[PDB]
Write an enzyme that holds these catalytic residues in place. Structure first.
Site, PDB file in Angstrom:
ATOM      1  N   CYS A  13      -0.107  -2.977  -1.201  1.00 42.70           N
ATOM      2  CA  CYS A  13      -1.074  -4.071  -1.194  1.00 42.70           C
ATOM      3  C   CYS A  13      -0.364  -5.419  -1.154  1.00 42.70           C
ATOM      4  O   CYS A  13       0.337  -5.789  -2.106  1.00 42.70           O
ATOM      5  CB  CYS A  13      -1.993  -4.003  -2.427  1.00 42.70           C
ATOM      6  SG  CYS A  13      -3.117  -5.433  -2.585  1.00 42.70           S
TER       7      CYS A  13
ATOM      8  N   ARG B   4      -1.434  -8.623  -4.181  1.00 43.66           N
ATOM      9  CA  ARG B   4      -1.263  -8.439  -5.615  1.00 43.66           C
ATOM     10  C   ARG B   4      -0.927  -9.701  -6.404  1.00 43.66           C
ATOM     11  O   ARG B   4      -0.848  -9.624  -7.635  1.00 43.66           O
ATOM     12  CB  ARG B   4      -0.179  -7.401  -5.862  1.00 43.66           C
ATOM     13  CG  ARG B   4      -0.598  -5.982  -5.470  1.00 43.66           C
ATOM     14  CD  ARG B   4       0.531  -5.022  -5.764  1.00 43.66           C
ATOM     15  NE  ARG B   4       1.515  -5.018  -4.684  1.00 43.66           N
ATOM     16  CZ  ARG B   4       2.724  -4.480  -4.781  1.00 43.66           C
ATOM     17  NH1 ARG B   4       3.102  -3.937  -5.929  1.00 43.66           N
ATOM     18  NH2 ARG B   4       3.552  -4.483  -3.722  1.00 43.66           N
TER      19      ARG B   4
ATOM     20  N   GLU C  33      -6.730  -7.552   9.373  1.00 44.28           N
ATOM     21  CA  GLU C  33      -7.370  -6.264   9.091  1.00 44.28           C
ATOM     22  C   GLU C  33      -8.577  -6.043   9.987  1.00 44.28           C
ATOM     23  O   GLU C  33      -8.828  -4.919  10.442  1.00 44.28           O
ATOM     24  CB  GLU C  33      -7.797  -6.186   7.629  1.00 44.28           C
ATOM     25  CG  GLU C  33      -6.667  -6.164   6.598  1.00 44.28           C
ATOM     26  CD  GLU C  33      -7.217  -6.072   5.168  1.00 44.28           C
ATOM     27  OE1 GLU C  33      -7.549  -4.944   4.721  1.00 44.28           O
ATOM     28  OE2 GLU C  33      -7.323  -7.130   4.515  1.00 44.28           O
TER      29      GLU C  33
ATOM     30  N   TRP D 293     -10.922  -9.620  -0.825  1.00 46.77           N
ATOM     31  CA  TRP D 293     -11.301 -10.337   0.377  1.00 46.77           C
ATOM     32  C   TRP D 293     -10.279 -10.025   1.461  1.00 46.77           C
ATOM     33  O   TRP D 293      -9.153  -9.640   1.167  1.00 46.77           O
ATOM     34  CB  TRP D 293     -11.394 -11.836   0.091  1.00 46.77           C
ATOM     35  CG  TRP D 293     -10.148 -12.395  -0.473  1.00 46.77           C
ATOM     36  CD1 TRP D 293      -8.987 -12.661   0.203  1.00 46.77           C
ATOM     37  CD2 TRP D 293      -9.912 -12.757  -1.836  1.00 46.77           C
ATOM     38  NE1 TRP D 293      -8.046 -13.173  -0.656  1.00 46.77           N
ATOM     39  CE2 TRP D 293      -8.588 -13.252  -1.912  1.00 46.77           C
ATOM     40  CE3 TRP D 293     -10.698 -12.742  -2.995  1.00 46.77           C
ATOM     41  CZ2 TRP D 293      -8.026 -13.705  -3.106  1.00 46.77           C
ATOM     42  CZ3 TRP D 293     -10.141 -13.191  -4.180  1.00 46.77           C
ATOM     43  CH2 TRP D 293      -8.817 -13.671  -4.228  1.00 46.77           C
TER      44      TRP D 293
END
Ligand code: HEM
Ligand code: HEM
Ligand SMILES: C[C@H](O)[C@H](O)[C@H]1CNc2nc(N)[nH]c(=O)c2N1
Ligand SMILES: C[C@H](O)[C@H](O)[C@H]1CNc2nc(N)[nH]c(=O)c2N1
Ligand SMILES: CNCCCc1cc(C)cc(N)n1
Ligand SMILES: CNCCCc1cc(C)cc(N)n1
Ligand SMILES: [Zn+2]
Lengths: 414, 420
Positions: free
Chosen positions: B118, B121, B295, B290
């Site tokens: 991720c 973070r 993506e 969000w």
């Protein structure tokens, strides 16, 4: 045992048995992955050399359907004789060619390996002086350049003996541009090569102090101090960079050399170490257009290109860097193609690598591959390799990194 | 041995990792093989198949409680020793145990903190945790998810949240959200052979229809929720559309771009993963944050087995599509990601570009090395899917290792569910 790798875009699954043949560290452990470490971190004894040599000879006679033959056993015996008497041994020409091709075939970071079996091997193990090395390298450059119709080649100098008599090409590539730091903190030319340019100037090179000065060769034979040579300019093929739509692009005054030729790596075959083994292929466009031109630590031309494009450079979210990067890479490809100098775009290259990878799994049992390096530095997920699982392991023969020579050489003059 | 260095090759900053010494399970790699680009390299789990014996669950419980009481400068305190004895009795009498509210919140936040894939973070300790462990039915799950979605959406000023349903007990009574995300578009297998909508979701869309969902059969049909409570058959629920914030995609220069008729939802909410805390497995734990623009614009719109809209954008741009070397795919790819970012920002829906996100992650790494002694990071996943090397993470070495608590993958429930 078997390991499966899947392509998540096609759902093709391949079965790796070849990884059972590896026997050097990846750097990872069972609880830590170092897959993104650049370098996950002086001569073999008689006892260490024996099984390395046997493994290689065994693999070569197997490659040619002669495993167990009288000629296989006699070669093993002959090699053991040499190690016993001389603490080293000498490859046959056939073994040297085989070993050099398989180091390329085993290069997990190289996306161009579909070409591995078409490699021109120049045996330079009779060379004794830096003048001789210069001669061999000039011949290599001329052969590989082939007036723009590039041909892959490698030139192999004498193997390491005691570690005090190494042959080295001090350049990291055969053809690279100089870089000069300025008093005001700016840089002229290629910032990656500032250090090596300093070494050359110190050895007596008279720099033109321009943006694209081809560096001299700095060549070390038999452990002696290295010597400078100017490659004849007519052997250095270069491409002026222009853009098919932006007529202003040529006014940036950009150019690049056509022949990529790595000269700082070490070729290991059967436990023998070939510390000078320059090899060359042809460029994938993003090597020049993304990294060479647009790395912040390199030529760093995104700003100027974006300015001439009238991009909104106030917000990152305008993606001005992304838009400028594509156009630079378009220019690079259009320019090489117009001048009929071999080059491959990242889409074509990665498509061929997937075909190569699948062929390798079928006929060889796998293909070691370094995803971190195989995926191009732009537009990653619109290339087929992005969705391709890969296994990384180290087969030998292999190309290895080695210390830079100015960090280990002990000088002799005055 | 007891320290590993990572170098950034742009800045020459070196960081020194000792946190990896606390890593618990296998990466899949060995001395001889690196599995860093395998999607699921390892099946090494901390608890076996299902309902564990005492000698399997308690040591994992003790380790997590130990870690939580150390985190708050206790360890060995009165409340820690009593907590150990309380978990001991609970396992003795129920074969499981229940987390305190504080432990649950600590565990959720640290699973996010430990999520090596991720890039987001730096936000890890700002996570709203909704305790839904009292839920008993798919109707109750629906209520909890609607509240999550409304809270997290916050009229476009998105807020990170997780909703945690009851943990696994024997494995026949799992709570599951069958959707992979709370909000996705349907995908329809067309009679000729092509696909309408999102091709990723064709199977899930077909399960929904097979369950009695009446599809509108369009390109952006928000799928229903398919919710499973206490191992019963899953049930369909329509999210009220006023809770589903969407952004029509336009481009700041190409006026024709809007006529493509594209849009996307604002809330990314992963709902198919498993949250593991101290040996306990929460099989339904939808979390949301969000988007990073890529993506949507790189993967959702431009993957081949997804919406695959490079074709159309390129034609409208009048690009040469004869050969790959014109980089027409690359050029359209940039325009689409510009449009996405412009569209979200115009509607004041939270979004981050891949330049800002990766810059934040480098700062997060530096923070984590300074206070924690390391930060597990998966380079293959952190590096964005476009323009990789003009982002700072491309040049950043990273160490990957598996810390607990964590989010784990788990089988799709329709491969394992025995229907009633
Ligand atoms: C023939 C066309 C070739 C193409 C298109 C090609 C392409 C590439 C590319 C894009 C890389 C990544 C390099 C970087 O980003 O710095 C690479 C790495 C590499 N290539 Fe190939 N290559 C070719 C030929 C060869 C040949 C002929 C050899 C050896 C005989 C070779 C051996 C290697 C090795 C060892 C690396 C790793 C270098 C490193 O780790 O720094 N390649 N190649
Ligand atoms: C707040 C803004 C956030 C951003 C910008 C962000 C960004 C990302 C991105 C770009 C990925 C790659 C996933 C993909 O490409 O499909 C990812 C993965 C992931 N994120 Fe974050 N994320 C955020 C919040 C969160 C939160 C709140 C959690 C948990 C509480 C979380 C946990 C994860 C996990 C577990 C993965 C791996 C998922 C998988 O393997 O499919 N993230 N994130
Ligand atoms: C094979 C490869 O690991 C796979 O396609 C991964 C690569 N990296 C990724 N990175 C992100 N952020 N998201 C992904 O889905 C993937 N896919
Ligand atoms: C840190 C990271 O490993 C490093 O920047 C790598 C990433 N991938 C790469 N890939 C290629 N082809 N060439 C490179 O120099 C790099 N650099
Ligand atoms: C270390 N990378 C620098 C250049 C790498 C390389 C080598 C070769 C033989 C071809 C190519 N296209 N690129
Ligand atoms: C497979 N992952 C799909 C969605 C990943 C994701 C999750 C979250 C919480 C935020 C974000 N920006 N992205
Ligand atoms: Zn690894």
């Amino acid at each position: 045992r078997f390991l499966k790798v899947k392509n998540w875009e096609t759902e093709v699954v391949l079965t790796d048995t070849l990884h059972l043949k590896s026997t050097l560290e990846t750097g990872c452990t069972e609880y830590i992955c170092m897959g993104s470490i650049m370098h996950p971190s002086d001569v073999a004894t008689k006892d260490q050399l024996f099984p390395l040599a046997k493994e290689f000879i065994d693999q070569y006679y197997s490659s040619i359907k002669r495993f167990g033959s009288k000629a296989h056993m006699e070669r093993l015996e002959e090699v053991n004789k040499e190690i016993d008497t001389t603490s080293t041994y000498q490859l046959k020409d056939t073994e040297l060619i085989y070993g050099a091709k398989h180091a390329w075939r085993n290069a997990s970071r190289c996306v161009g390996r579909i070409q591995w079996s078409k490699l021109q091997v120049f045996d330079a193990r009779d060379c004794t002086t830096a003048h001789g090395m210069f001669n061999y390298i000039c011949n290599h450059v001329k052969y590989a350049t082939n007036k723009g119709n590039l041909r892959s080649a490698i030139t192999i100098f004498p193997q390491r003996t005691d570690g005090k008599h190494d042959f080295r090409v001090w350049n990291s590539q055969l053809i690279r541009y100089a870089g000069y730091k300025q008093p005001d903190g700016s840089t002229l030319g290629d910032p990656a090569n500032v250090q090596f340019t300093e070494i050359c100037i110190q050895q007596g090179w008279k720099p033109p102090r321009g943006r694209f000065d081809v560096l001299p060769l700095l060549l070390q034979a038999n452990g002696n101090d290295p010597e400078l040579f100017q490659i004849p300019p007519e052997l250095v093929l270069e491409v002026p960079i222009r853009h098919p739509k932006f007529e202003w692009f040529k006014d940036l005054g950009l150019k690049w050399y056509g022949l990529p030729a790595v000269s700082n790596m070490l070729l290991e075959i059967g436990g023998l170490e070939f510390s000078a083994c320059p090899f060359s292929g042809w460029y994938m466009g993003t090597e020049i257009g993304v990294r060479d031109y647009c790395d912040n630590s390199r030529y760093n031309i995104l700003e100027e290109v974006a300015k001439k494009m009238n991009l909104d450079m106030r917000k990152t979210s305008s993606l001005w860097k992304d838009q400028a990067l594509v156009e630079i890479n378009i220019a690079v490809l259009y320019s090489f193609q117009s001048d009929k100098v071999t080059i491959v775009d990242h889409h074509s290259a990665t498509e061929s690598f997937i075909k190569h990878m699948e062929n390798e799994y079928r006929c060889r049992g796998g293909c070691p591959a370094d995803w971190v390096w195989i995926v191009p530095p732009m537009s990653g997920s619109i290339t087929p390799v992005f969705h391709q699982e890969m296994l990384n392991y180290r087969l030998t023969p292999s190309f290895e990194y080695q210390p830079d020579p100015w960090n280990t050489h002990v000088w002799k003059l005055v």
